A = this chain, B = another copy of it.
Amino acid sequence: GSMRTCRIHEISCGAHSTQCIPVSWRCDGENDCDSGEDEENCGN
């Protein structure tokens, strides 16, 4: 299930990955996460 729900303003970087990226890194144009979930479903 959910692994490591991280902190107040993290993204948890995938439900099955142990990574925390700040919210400022979401849809920044860079694949910070290994899975790249941060760049998925961009452009609302």
Give the interface of A toward B (CB within 8 A): 1-5, 16, 31, 34-36
Contacts and interface: CB of A to CB of B under 8 A. Distances in A.
Copies in the complex: 2
Contact of A5 (B1, B5, B16, B31): B31
A3 B31 CA distance: 12
Contacts of A16: 1
A32 to B, nearest CB: 12
Contact of A2 (B1, B3, B5, B35): B35
A5 B5 CA distance: 23
A2 B39 CA distance: 13
11 contacts: A1-B16, A1-B35, A2-B35, A2-B36, A3-B34, A3-B35, A4-B34, A4-B35, A5-B31, A5-B35, A5-B36
